[PDB]
Swiss-Prot record:
<comment type="similarity">
    <text>Belongs to the nuclear hormone receptor family. NR1 subfamily.</text>
</comment>
<protein>
    <recommendedName>
        <fullName>Nuclear receptor ROR-gamma</fullName>
    </recommendedName>
</protein>
<comment type="function">
    <text>Nuclear receptor that binds DNA as a monomer to ROR response elements (RORE) containing a single core motif half-site 5'-AGGTCA-3' preceded by a short A-T-rich sequence. Key regulator of cellular differentiation, immunity, peripheral circadian rhythm as well as lipid, steroid, xenobiotics and glucose metabolism. Considered to have intrinsic transcriptional activity, have some natural ligands like oxysterols that act as agonists (25-hydroxycholesterol) or inverse agonists (7-oxygenated sterols), enhancing or repressing the transcriptional activity, respectively.</text>
</comment>
<feature type="domain" description="NR LBD">
    <location>
        <begin position="5"/>
        <end position="235"/>
    </location>
</feature>
<comment type="subunit">
    <text>Interacts (via AF-2 motif) with the coactivator NCOA2 (via LXXLL motif). Interacts with the corepressor NCOR1. Interacts with CRY1. Interacts (via AF-2 motif) with the coactivators NCOA1 and PPARGC1A (via LXXLL motif). Interacts (via AF-2 motif) with PROX1. Interacts with FOXP3. Interacts with NR0B2.</text>
</comment>
Length: 235
């Protein structure tokens, strides 16, 4: 693994994210000024829990598709056996979307971009899961505080997806190699960008999995399947 090869991987992954971002940071940042009216907020609050969950799930599944395209554009993912592909995606897909949310969250007004405007926790009152919603906002707040580069998100999301420790992997060694190469790339780019600091400040592995486990649990309580099981992708 030559420096030049490693630099190539950094470029590949960062470009892949740029293509599969799903939204433009520029656009999100400009839209921060546009905020939901109190009347609009009360409207969302008035909606039935069932309607909101369907609406939310539509957005989530949309995002997961983009994440899957990101995974396909990652080097070596395609080479892995279907079983190993699905395992990595199953475990990581939702985890990646939670990371990508940090872009949408605005720390000043504590609002997130939902259906074309910025809104606070108040919007999702209908769901009646205040603790889950608060935790997602808190998680996003921390990442927003870090002022994550698009290039940093790209490498981090990739590392989330590509983990040898995920159970059910037959080709563990192959995934390990891919993980280590992406690990090197992340460290290398942080050295180059003088952002070595952020490693310590990153959320622990445990916390990412915790929020995703409970998120899937709530969807399963409603008449829904795991998004990888309900995959229009892998057709």
């Amino acid at each position: 693994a030559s420096l030049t090869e490693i630099e190539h991987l950094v470029q590949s992954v960062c470009k892949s994210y740029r293509e599969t971002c799903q939204l433009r940071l520029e656009d999100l940042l400009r839209q921060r000024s546009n905020i939901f009216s109190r009347e609009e907020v009360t409207g969302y609050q008035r909606k039935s829990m069932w309607e909101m969950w369907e609406r939310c799930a539509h957005h989530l599944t949309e995002a997961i598709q983009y994440v899957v395209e990101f995974a396909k554009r990652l080097s070596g993912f395609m080479e892995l056996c279907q079983n190993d592909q699905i395992v990595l995606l199953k475990a990581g897909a939702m985890e990646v979307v939670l990371v990508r949310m940090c872009r949408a969250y605005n720390a000043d007004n504590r609002t997130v971009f939902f259906e074309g405007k910025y809104g606070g926790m108040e919007l999702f009152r209908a769901l009646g899961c205040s603790e889950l919603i608060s935790s997602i906002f808190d998680f996003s707040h921390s990442l927003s505080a870090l002022h994550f580069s698009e290039d940093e998100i790209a490498l981090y999301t990739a590392l989330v997806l590509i983990n040898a420790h995920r159970p059910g992997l037959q080709e563990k060694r192959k995934v390990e190699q891919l993980q280590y190469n992406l690990e090197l790339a992340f460290h290398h780019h942080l050295c180059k960008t003088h952002r070595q600091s952020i490693l310590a400040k990153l959320p622990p592995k445990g916390k990412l999995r915790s929020l995703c486990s409970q998120h899937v649990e709530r969807l399963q309580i409603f008449q829904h399947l795991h998004p990888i099981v309900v995959q229009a992708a892998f057709p």
